[PDB]
């Protein structure tokens, strides 16, 4: 039926303007009362309403962001556009556009959503990570994959031969605008002197590969 | 504007359970309240529209009721796919507000975290900074508190943490906290301590190390 897809830049520099586009099909912005809204969600946080525009063109913005937001619609393109000015790292989140039925009762909900586009606000340039050891009947060891940009990075242990006990944590965007994540694995103490542990790190964005052997 | 309070914010349950969560509005929103289920990595999905109407295609186990300032969403029998985060939204007033969400995870016996502390590496130390990390491994419930101390001074504003998703096999969580200091500061202190507060620990646990010892 109805589907929507958000598009725009995945990476934006602090201060700059973020322009998002919602393309949809299965309905048109000329059907009576129909609306298209924008909702954002910061990493691990709740949904936040941003704005909405309707068939007859009225629109509403979130009071706190309204001198920074502009919503428009091109009906021959079947698209809705959202412009957010002077973005900052706190604007880093996933942005969703969604459809709202018009009167035929059930206008009380956003019934179909886009998959969302995640946008990251940072002033940094591509940069490979530095890999540091996290070292010591159960023992823990790991690797600190620090200061890389942009996401993502892949971490495996012993070239994939080691999987159970492994926990690769969600990276954190630091105040420096660079990412940092840790990957750890729990193993038997008795294995520490006969078994070797190496974390394989790959940050394709920067073509950076590192194999880091970790010992006590 | 209009405050929508969802509760409980976090809920633990098992497949086959019957649960009811609530969404409270500071002002009356008549019947203009919708409920959505959101699974990690996926967009919200409409369950209930107009407070009590089951959205076409949504399973019959889902139901909603309420009007004015009180609303509830009930799941007659919890399924695997229901362990997710639920949100309510009112579309009676502008701006359209979303609740803070209710987190439903898999229940298992309480499990205290295994804690480990890792001093910064010598190699990192000359890059100019020191990252000391604390690991809280395989615990349940999710709520956990990490407190960093350096020479007994409580650290604040210089650490960050992240938690893994609930494990598919053992239903535990693991957490990683990183305390970041300049090398100079790292060198002028001695005891580095990570204090963990968790339900499965009768008393907070402290893992520590003395720099250079």
């Amino acid at each position: 039926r109805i589907t929507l897809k958000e598009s725009g830049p995945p990476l934006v520099k602090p201060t700059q303007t973020l322009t998002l586009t919602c393309s949809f099909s299965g309905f048109s912005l000329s059907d009576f009362g129909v609306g298209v809204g924008w909702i954002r969600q910061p990493p691990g946080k709740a949904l936040e309403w941003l704005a909405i525009i309707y068939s007859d063109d009225d629109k509403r913005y979130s009071p706190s962001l309204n001198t920074r937001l502009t919503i428009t619609k091109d009906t021959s393109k079947n698209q809705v556009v959202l412009v957010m000015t002077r973005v900052s790292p706190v604007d880093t989140a996933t942005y969703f556009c969604a459809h709202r039925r018009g009167p035929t009762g059930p206008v009380n909900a956003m019934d179909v959503w886009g998959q969302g586009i995640t946008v990251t606000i940072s002033s940094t340039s591509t940069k490979g990570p530095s890999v540091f050891p996290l070292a010591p009947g159960t023992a823990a060891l790991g690797c600190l994959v620090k200061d890389y940009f942009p996401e993502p990075v892949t971490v495996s242990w012993n070239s994939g031969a080691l999987t159970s006990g492994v926990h690769t944590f969600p990276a954190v965007l630091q105040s420096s605008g660079l990412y940092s994540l840790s990957s750890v694995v729990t193993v038997p103490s008795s294995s520490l002197g006969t078994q070797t542990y190496t974390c394989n790190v790959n940050h394709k964005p920067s073509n950076t590969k590192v194999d880091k052997r970790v010992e006590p | 504007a209009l405050q929508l309070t969802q509760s409980p914010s976090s809920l633990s349950a098992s497949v086959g359970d019957r649960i009811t969560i609530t969404c409270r509005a500071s002002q009356g929103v008549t019947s203009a309240l919708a409920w959505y289920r959101q699974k990690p990595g996926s967009p919200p999905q409409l369950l209930i529209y107009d407070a009590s109407s089951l959205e076409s295609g949504v399973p019959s186990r889902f139901s909603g009721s309420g009007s004015g300032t009180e609303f509830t969403l009930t799941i007659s029998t919890l399924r695997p796919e229901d362990f997710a985060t639920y949100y309510c939204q009112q579309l009676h007033f502008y701006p359209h507000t979303f609740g803070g969400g209710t987190r439903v995870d898999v229940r298992r016996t309480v499990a205290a975290p295994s804690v480990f502390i890792f001093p910064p590496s010598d190699e990192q130390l000359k890059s100019g900074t020191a990252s000391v990390v604390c690991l809280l491994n395989n615990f349940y419930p999710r709520e956990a508190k990490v407190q960093w101390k350096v020479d007994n001074a409580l650290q604040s504003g210089n650490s960050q943490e992240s938690v893994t998703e609930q494990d598919s096999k053992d239903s535990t969580y693991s957490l990683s906290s990183t305390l970041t200091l300049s090398k100079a500061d790292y060198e002028k202190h001695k005891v580095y301590e990570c204090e963990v507060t968790h339900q499965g620990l009768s008393s907070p646990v402290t893992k520590s190390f003395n720099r250079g010892e």
């Binding site: 009362g33 609306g35 009380n108 | 203009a32 009676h92």
Partner: peptide, 8 residues
């Protein structure tokens, strides 16, 4: 607080 477009 303003009412939604369909609140009426």
């Amino acid at each position: 607080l303003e009412l939604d477009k369909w609140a009426s």
